[PDB]
Write a protein that binds this ligand. Sequence first.
Ligand SMILES: CNC(=O)c1cc(C(=O)NC2CC2)cn([C@H](C)c2ccccc2)c1=O
Length: 111
Amino acid sequence: GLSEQLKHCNGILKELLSKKHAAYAWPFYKPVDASALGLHDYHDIIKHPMDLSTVKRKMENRDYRDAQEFAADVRLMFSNCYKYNPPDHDVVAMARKLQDVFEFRYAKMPD
Ligand SMILES: CNC(=O)c1cc(C(=O)NC2CC2)cn([C@H](C)c2ccccc2)c1=O
């Protein structure tokens, strides 16, 4: 009728986690460890943390009911990065590059 659109989403997720994009994807692999990185304001600024490992667990557990819900979580992850980090930080440049990969492939969703 995973749905056909959620299989496309799963394909995108596999690509975002692949060695192809690892040079700029790695900050998004796991939840931000705020205490480890000394980001003691992170959880005051970011109310809904998101990362690719959480998206993968949700996909594996069939949590997403459609492609829109999946895309909202991936975009939440990028938005958190843009909200917390200064716009000239290396992690924001990496977010922009990984979001470009995401948005162009998400746009190729089969109807
Ligand atoms: C989603 N990831 C983050 O928001 C994030 C923030 C900060 C961070 O220190 N943010 C401070 C507000 C500047 C550092 N990193 C890692 C450790 C990093 C360090 C150097 C280059 C690229 C990435 C993140 O992944």
